[PDB]
Amino acid sequence: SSRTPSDKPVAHVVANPQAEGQLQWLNRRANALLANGVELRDNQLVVPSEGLYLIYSQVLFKGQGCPSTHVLLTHTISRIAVSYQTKVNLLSAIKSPCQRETPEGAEAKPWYEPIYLGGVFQLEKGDRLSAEINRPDYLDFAESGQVYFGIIAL
Amino acid sequence: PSDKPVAHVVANPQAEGQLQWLNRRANALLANGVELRDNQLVVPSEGLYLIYSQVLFKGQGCPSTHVLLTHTISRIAVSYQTKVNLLSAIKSPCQRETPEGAEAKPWYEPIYLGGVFQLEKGDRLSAEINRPDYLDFAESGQVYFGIIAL
Amino acid sequence: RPSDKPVAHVVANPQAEGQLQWLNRRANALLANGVELRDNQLVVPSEGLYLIYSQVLFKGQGCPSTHVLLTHTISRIAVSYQTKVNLLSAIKSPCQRETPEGAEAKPWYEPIYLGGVFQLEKGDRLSAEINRPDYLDFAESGQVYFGIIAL
Amino acid sequence: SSRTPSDKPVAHVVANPQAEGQLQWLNRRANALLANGVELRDNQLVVPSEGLYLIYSQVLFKGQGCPSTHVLLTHTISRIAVSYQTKVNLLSAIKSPCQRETPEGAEAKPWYEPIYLGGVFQLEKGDRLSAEINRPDYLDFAESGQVYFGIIAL
Amino acid sequence: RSSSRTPSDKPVAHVVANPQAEGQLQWLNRRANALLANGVELRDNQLVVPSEGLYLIYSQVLFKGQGCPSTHVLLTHTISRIAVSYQTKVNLLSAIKSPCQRETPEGAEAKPWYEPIYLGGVFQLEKGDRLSAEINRPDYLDFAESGQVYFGIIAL
Amino acid sequence: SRTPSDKPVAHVVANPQAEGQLQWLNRRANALLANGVELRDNQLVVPSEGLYLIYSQVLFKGQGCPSTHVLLTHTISRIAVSYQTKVNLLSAIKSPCQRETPEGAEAKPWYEPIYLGGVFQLEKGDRLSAEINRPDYLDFAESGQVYFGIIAL
Amino acid sequence: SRTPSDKPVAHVVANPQAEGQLQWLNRRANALLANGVELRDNQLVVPSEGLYLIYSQVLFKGQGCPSTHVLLTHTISRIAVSYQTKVNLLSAIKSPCQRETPEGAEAKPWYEPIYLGGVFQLEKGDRLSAEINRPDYLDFAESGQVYFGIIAL
Amino acid sequence: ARVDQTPQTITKETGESLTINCVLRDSHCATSSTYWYRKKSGSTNEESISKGGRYVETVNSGSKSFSLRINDLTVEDSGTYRCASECQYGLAEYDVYGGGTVVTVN
Amino acid sequence: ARVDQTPQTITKETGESLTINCVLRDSHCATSSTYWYRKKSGSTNEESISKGGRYVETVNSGSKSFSLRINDLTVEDSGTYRCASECQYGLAEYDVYGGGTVVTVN
Amino acid sequence: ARVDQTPQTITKETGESLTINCVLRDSHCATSSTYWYRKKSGSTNEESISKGGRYVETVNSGSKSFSLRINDLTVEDSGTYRCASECQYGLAEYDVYGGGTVVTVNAAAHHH
Amino acid sequence: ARVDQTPQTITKETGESLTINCVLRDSHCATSSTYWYRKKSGSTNEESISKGGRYVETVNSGSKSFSLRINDLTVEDSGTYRCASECQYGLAEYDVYGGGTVVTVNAA
Amino acid sequence: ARVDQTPQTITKETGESLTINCVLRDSHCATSSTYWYRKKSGSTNEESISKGGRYVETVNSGSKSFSLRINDLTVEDSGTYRCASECQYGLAEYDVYGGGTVVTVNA
Amino acid sequence: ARVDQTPQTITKETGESLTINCVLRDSHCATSSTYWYRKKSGSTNEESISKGGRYVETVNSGSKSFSLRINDLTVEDSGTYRCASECQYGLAEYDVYGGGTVVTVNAA
Ligand SMILES: [Cl-]
């Protein structure tokens, strides 16, 4: 059964916990939404109507000890548009979790570093938004809403 | 005349080791039906809301082992009356190197969470952290928490 | 995943046939937060209240007619008093009759356990010892051990 | 009214006196404890949190005569860990219950032999400890604190 | 923790009214001495027969009122069947009872009355038939105490 | 017809167009009489010795309560091959009108149902009968208000 | 004799010579108690676990109508080995004396019967007991008017 | 938790019957769209148990509870059984699961 | 009468710690599915306590008894607390409850 | 079991909006080739609902689930709605369906 | 001890009233959680006596004493009666019992 | 057994090549900081095998296993060959061992 | 849409075989007069595929559905493929089309 209608293109997808080493976006979980025309194609959100949208995403990175000094974690929301068919970054962040260190004599030092991105944009019909990370081997989608990604038509 | 339920609460600075939310402060909001009950925001109407909160952690040194700073926004609903996390984040502030008999090095680590969710009438939101002894409510707008029905 | 405080639980070496030697790098054994393992001696790293305990299991395949005396003592040498003194000790006679003889079969096992709380100082060397290390049974696991814990 | 606030997982369980010839552990009796997270599943204690514990247990054996000489008395504390899923003995002791003279005639000789075990160990989340004996037909839980078993978070 | 310790079959059901229902007759199975197993499903306060065969159908209801607001009150209790073969509600067992004998407590104050009605019989039912135990006056139900109102079937 | 058979069973219903009579019928919707149980002279004839469940309901209705002081009885009787005397297996009595001819209010229809049920050991050739003392107050109008049946348990 | 038959069964009837009390009897004509059901302290003891059919009827009869509104009860209880507390499985209450407490005479017998039946899961050693609150209104005269029994379905 | 599977560990003998019960705690899931899945010990296939014959399903919409009795148990029925339901309120659509292991000894 | 919650009324001060004990009297209910519920004075919601952190649960299946210790007590912890359990024998499935109220003064 | 249409019986009020969700259980069927058909109560003809305007379709290929939210409900929108999808593996090509009924009740227009 | 049943042997007549008194000696047990159990002579089941009707219970929290008066005695009320209490201090929670026998003869 | 040597008692005349596998069962032991030992004709003591050389070591942290391929097989000695690893969790520090017999004849 | 071309987006490798299926939804179009067209990306010529060799066609007149399996794929066979059919009922004559794109990637 259903209740009050509600509208606007909406999306809040959560990572698949059962995906091992990859970022699969899901909507068929408790506090996730995907309605009113928003399509999730090849792990990509397709805008159903032209207007102003709010884009957000969080990624949580965890590693058990620091192997490399030159470890860089990235997270970007990209857009390939119908008018300009090249994927361009709308929101981006870079984070270095390890300042040298490289534990020689130690007992593993688990690090946690989250990254959050958000912005308002004008999108056109058929544009594909994509949230991507460079190292999907450090994703920590364990307990809950630690990794997510969504748009909402404002 | 602005409708839509809204809330933007900020921590009490003169609160001893605790995260107490205040609404009768300069740049804070709690109107159009959202009530702040037992340190929790009560959603007044069913619809789509934007939920966000930020917490700033400060410490005067890295003690023993690792501290985990967590920041989570929970929802206990009338339909499923158990507190479940909507947004969560964890951060380890200390990259090992505990002060080896030298002097301290104050660290700052903030954590931000935000997202859109469907809430029903009577749902209770709460923004919470595990170590209220590392809260830095010294300045204004360093720790806050709010919703708006979009 | 933190730590605690000075602690130790060392167990005899099974591959030291006919000798008592305490080991720390073995399954379910501890020696951390400052306790040192010297020449079968534990060195207390801090002044305070400690719990000292040890168990020994004696096993023989025959009963001699010498009234065997099995002893087990935990000793302490302090910086303040440079002499070996017993803190905990016990004696036990395992064989009562006049040897198996007629029915030559005496697989006997007899354990002894010791425990107590003491105030120990920096540099004190504690030692758990037995008088007849030829009947020691380190055949199975955690049957002979010795340890301290800072209360 | 429980006027005394106190913590650290602790347990001191005693054998069931009304349990024929079996070792069933009880906590809802006089001076026995089971609190702050320690669970008793199947005569097994479940460690509620990772840390350093002190483990102890005593068993008192009584029989009404030695008919055969084929009796070996054991008392063992075993541990099944999440890291190594095999039951290993933490503390063990063996005792010869009948020295000799195997009562030939006019037996009528109740014999008593106690065994005590204690030591300090590191336990992890979910570790299951069990105190076990070889012949639960020699259990003497008739008096008071003659058989017991417990852990304490130091 | 424990385990089950008996095997048994034949569709069975003995559902009892919800005490926390106030003025309605909602059937429950998740209560002490009640059964609903071996295929019988309860949809809209209706039992759906899972297999064709001969069943024993029974139900009891307890009516209680603390006064008669009229001398013309009628209490009824019926078990009905809508079948896949003939999709019309037909009564299988029915009973009527008149609770107030020329009173409508006029010359005196209110007075608590109790009146039960019981139904039982054997019938041949087919798969997918929807049986319903129904009453016309659900405000006089006394499901306070124990097994005072119930409804069940069992495959013989 | 699609499914198997079971065991001696009977569920007979009163005839609605039989005024002042408790005529039992079996060729009527949601009524059964099969696997050897026979309905002869308003009596069920047991086809095999064994344990049976005997049940019957009667609905009494009247359109006024005089002070006649009427006693309504409902009994299931048994005439067995071993003991050829009618003995009651299940019985109940009920007084429907405890008044003194209500003067002011007219009509005021009273309804009283009665149910009987129990398990008994019956032999071959036993004839069970459901009977009422006053078939002049019987309400055999609507469905399943009067019935009588056995089932081999 | 004749057919073997099994299935634990019992149909016990009231003692007619039982003043102000409900004593259950088993050795009287068309009454049964065999195949493991034993009768202890006016209680039936279930001999084996399974699904049973439980029933009981009691007939209350009185000559007067005192104490404004008197409440007559009849309940079947179960004390199980798993949970050693007497709990009601089937229960019913009935008010026999309508508001109007007779004023003027002293003779007018009322009749009220009460019947209970249901299916329940009983285990080894369960003790069922059928009881009423007023053993001074019992009609243990006549035929099968008061009884109590179980049968394993 | 959303959906509560009660008999989490059952151990039966060949030729008997295990009953697994699930209760809904989320009032948006329907007692109409229930699903059952078993994954036999040692295999990487979660199979969908079908309702008919040996697999009996009992549903009560009032208590938002369903059960799954499995009869004629063999030794090939050793695995982990989960229940499922389809939930829907407004713009939200999701499904819910439980957990519980079965081992049959011969 | 199926579960006996022993501390029926407690009055503690802010900061202390209350323990609530429940004992199973029916041998068909399992200590593997124990549940806890609080209803805060002034709210119309029975909330379910999550087993973890401030809420520690100790169970002994031998005695069919479980407990719930709550530490760091506030005045927001004043309400009626109940325990629960899942029972299953033959064809029967049911649940059990108790009762007991808490008030904390500041 | 090969497409699972979830809201089987729906009853909405005139002027509202119902969503029907279908989940693919055959991992060879494509969420790109989805089809919708409604059959109005009492008439015999399956008409194909077109994707646009009042009929909004939400698809997620990751979980292989698609839905059909219908707005502006009238009383002429009472019928049996089914979803469909086109499957293709090796040398095999097939299609799949579901089932679910809608009844819309009128508003009654209050007269003063 | 911790609980003392006062009348260990009672012998009453059909139609009478027996009182069984229990006094708590352990100051951790609560007179609020009182329990009564009957085991009829010859039976191996301890049943739980339900406080109500024929069973009247009198309790005093100050002296830690409770009693159990039974009215309308029959011959089916003859058995071993025990009282019980739920004790709980800081981290400890336990229960306590007593013992005391009743035999009822008929009036004939 | 905390460490599982699969290839054990064998008699391989001088000249052969086959890996001896050890599998870690304790999740606290590391695939790194590992050392290998072979006996001395099974008469006296065990030798401490050095790094590389005539000995082959295969390590993979994903499978928590290390191996020893017997290359350049001459007649060094017989006996029981053991593998070992350094394990350490929190306040605990311990090690694990193995065992497996090889017998070498000549032409 | 009268006639439904099913595989809308395809990506296969050099040396493979793609099957393109079309189902008729207009009951007036015939599976006897079916047509196939390929249009290479970057070309403005819609070419007519001939039925034979690399182009195998499967037809079912009962289901009014036809397919086109294409074998020995090269990298020059990347383009938009359409299917067609000619319909006729009364005084009516028309044709129908679909839509679906192919991309093939090379190798070394
Ligand atoms: Cl547009």
Chains near L, with 3+ CB pairs < 8 A? A, C, D
- CA–CA distance, B60 with B78 (Å, rounded to integer): 42
Structure tokens at D115: 């065994």
- Contact list, E32 vs chain G (CB under 8 Å): 87
**Shortest Cα distance from F110 to chain E (angstroms)?**
5
Best J2, J4, J6 residue to mutate vs chain H (most H CBs within 10 Å): J6
Q: Distance from J86 to chain H by nearest Cα, in Å? A: 22
- Closest CA in chain J for residue H91: J19
Distance from CA of J83 to the nearest CA of M (A): 16
Decide if F116 and G57 are in contact by the 8 Å CB cutoff: yes
- With CA atoms as reference, report the closest residue to F88 among G150, H50, M33, G141: G141
CA pair distance D39, J27, nearest whole angstrom: 44
- Asked if D84's CB is within 8 angstroms of L89's CB, the reply is no
Q: Encode A70-121 in three state secondary structure.
A: CCCEEEEEEEECCCCCCCEEEEEEEECCCCCCCCCCCCCCEEEEEEEEEEEE
Partner residue opposite J6 with nearest CB, options H48, H88, H91: H88
Write the CB contacts of H67 (distance below 8 Å, at least 6 apart in sequence).
Answer: E37, H19, H20, H21, H22, H57, H58, I93
Please provide the size of chain M in residues: 108
Identity of residue I27: S
Cα distance between residue D153 and residue E21, in whole Å: 48
Pair E37, E89: CB distance under 8 Å: no
The sign one gets for the Cα dihedral A6, A7, A8, A10 is: positive
Contact E131, E153 (CB under 8 A): yes
Q: For residue E101, how many other CB atoms are within 10 A of its CB? A: 19
Residue K18 CB-half CA count within 13 A: 25
Asked if chain L contacts chain C via 3 or more Cβ pairs within 8 Å, the reply is: yes
Q: Are K79 and K102 in contact (CB under 8 A)?
A: yes
Q: What's chain C's Rg over C-alpha atoms?
A: 17
| Phi, psi (degrees; rounded to nearest 5) at I35 | -135, 150
Interface membership of H32 toward A (CB under 8 Å): no
Query: In chain E, after which residues is the C-to-N distance over 2.5 Å, breaking the chain?
Result: none
Q: Which of I64, K47, K82 is nearest to G84 (CA)?
A: K47
Contact K5, K82 (CB under 8 A): yes
G/K interface, count of CB pairs below 8 Å: 16
Give contacts of A30 with chain H, Cβ < 8 Å: 2, 26, 92, 94
Q: Which of F56, F81, F97, F98 to mutate to test the interface with G (most CBs of G within 10 A)?
A: F98
Q: How far apart are CA D100 and CA D113, in angstroms?
A: 14
C-alpha distances in Å from residue D32, one per residue of D52, G28, K93: 21, 57, 8
Closest listed residue to residue M55, CA positions, set M43, M41, M39, M72: M72
Assess A107–L contact: CB distance below 8 Å, yes or no. Answer: yes
Length of chain A: 154
Q: Would you state the structure tokens that stand for residue G24, as one six-digit string?
A: 């259950």
Question: Which among G84, G86, G125 has CB closest to K46?
Answer: G84
Give how far Cα E29 sits from Cα of E16, G75, H61, I84, Å: 7, 21, 10, 17
CB-CB neighbors (< 8 A) of M6 in chain J? 30, 33, 86, 88, 93
Q: Among D47, D83, D123, which would you mutate to test the L interface (most chain L Cβ atoms within 10 Å of its Cβ)? A: D83
Cα separation, K73 vs K66, whole angstroms: 20
Strand partners, M44: none
Whose CA is closest to M25, among M44, M40, M42, M6? M6
With CA atoms as reference, report the closest residue to C11 among E140, K41, D90. D90
Residue J14 CA, ligand 1 centroid: distance in Å: 27
CB C110 within 8 A of CB C57: yes
Q: Is B32 left (phi over 0), alpha (psi -120 to 50) or beta?
A: left
Resolution in A: 3.4
What six digits make up the tokens of F86? 């009618």
C-alpha dihedral, D81 to D84 to D90 to D95, nearest 10° = 110
Provide, as residue numbers in chain E, all residues whose Cβ is less than 8 Å from the Cβ of I94.
Answer: 30-32, 34
Residue E19 gets which letter from DSSP?
G
Are β-strands D88-95 and D44-46 bridged in parallel, bridged antiparallel, or unpaired? unpaired
DSSP E141: B
Q: What is the SS3 assignment for C16?
A: coil
Residues D152 and C51: beta-carbon distance below 8 Å: no
Q: How many angstroms separate the first and last alpha carbons of chain E?
A: 33
Give the Å distances, CA to CA, from E123 to B116, E53, F29, F75, L84: 57, 8, 10, 22, 76
Tokens at D104, concatenated:
């030939």
Q: Tell me if chain E has a CB within 8 Å of the CB of G136.
A: no
Task: State the Cα–Cα distance between residues E116 and L85, nearest whole angstrom.
Answer: 79
Residues with CB under 5 A from ligand 1 (ion): A 49-50
CA–CA dist B114, A116 (Å, integer): 8
Classify L106 as helix, strand or coil: coil
Question: Contact A39/J60, CB-based, under 8 Å?
Answer: yes
H75 vs H73: CA distance, rounded Å: 7
Alpha carbons B108 and F150: distance in angstroms, whole number: 85
Of C53, C107, C110, the CB nearest to D119: C53
**Which method resolved this structure?**
X-ray
Q: Which of A16, A18, A112 is nearest to A60 (CA)?
A: A112
Mapped onto helix, strand or coil, the DSSP state of residue E64 is strand
List CB contacts of G136: < 8 A, sequence separation 6 or more.
G20
Q: CB of F77 within 8 A of CB of F87? A: yes
Cα separation, F79 vs A24, whole angstroms: 80
Distance between CA atoms of residues A90 and A129, nearest Å: 9
Put simply, the answer to whether H93 touches J1 (Cβ < 8 Å) is no
Cβ distance I90 to E5 less than 8 Å, yes or no, reads yes
d(CA K26, CA K1): 8
Q: DSSP labels for K20-39?
A: EEEEE-STTEEEEEEEEEEE
Backbone angles phi, psi at H66, to 5 degrees: -135, 155
- Give yes or no for H91 touching A (CB within 8 A): yes
- Distance in angstroms (rounded) separating the CA atoms of residues I59 and I66: 4
Q: What DSSP letter does each residue of D86-134 carry, written as one string?
A: S-EEEEEEEE-S--S-TT-SS----EEEEEEEEEEEEE-TT-EEEEEES
CA A123 – ligand 1 centroid, Å:
10
Q: What is the CA(A48)–ligand 1 centre distance, in A?
A: 8
E127 to chain F: nearest residue by CA? F3
Calpha distance G83→G60 (Å, rounded): 32
Both tokens of residue B100? 């080896």
Beta carbons of F95 and F113 less than 8 angstroms apart = no
Task: Quote the CA–CA distance of I105 and I103 in Å, as a whole number.
Answer: 7
Chains contacting chain A through 3 or more C-beta pairs under 8 A? B, H, J, L
Q: How far is ligand 1, taken at its centre, from the CA of residue A51, in Å?
A: 8
Of G105, G114, G21, nearest to G65 (Cα)?
G105
Spacing of C-alpha E126 from chain mean position: 20
Which residue, among H44, H42, H49, has the nearest Cα to H81 in the 3D structure? H49
C25 contacts L94? CB cut-off 8 A? yes
CA distance L55 to chain D (A): 30
CA distance D111 to C117: 32
Q: Which of C1, C4, C25, C28 is the mutation pick for testing L, counting most L CBs within 10 A?
A: C25
Chain D contact present for L94, CB below 8 A: no
Of G25, D73, G113, G100, which Cα lies nearest the Cα of F65?
G100
Q: Are D65 and D108 in contact (CB under 8 A)?
A: yes
Q: H65 touching E, CB under 8 A?
A: yes
Do at least 3 CB pairs under 8 Å connect E with J?
no
Q: Cα-flanking dihedrals φ and ψ of residue C20, to 5°?
A: -105, 115
Q: Using CB atoms, pick whichever of A4, A12, A30 lies closest to residue B46.
A: A4
Of the candidates H2, H90, H91, the beta carbon closest to that of B80 is on: H2
| 3 state SS of D96 | coil
Q: Which 3 state secondary structure label does DSSP give I2? A: coil
The 3-class secondary structure across chain H, one letter per residue, is: CCCEECCCEEEEECCCCEEEEEECCCCCEEEEEEEEEEEECCCCCCEEECCECCEEEEEECCCCEEEEEECCCCCCCCEEEEEEEEEECCCCEEEEECCCEEEEEC
- Judge whether D17 is closer than 8 Å to chain C, CB to CB: no
- Chain C environment of B65 (Cβ under 8 Å): 2-3
Residues of A in contact with L89 (CB under 8 A): 107
Residue H58 is nearest to which of E3, E27, E41, comparing CB atoms? E41
Residues in chain D, overall count: 154
Residues in chain E with CB shorter than 8 Å from the CB of H34 are none
Phi-psi region at I58: left, alpha or beta (left = phi > 0; alpha = psi -120 to 50): beta
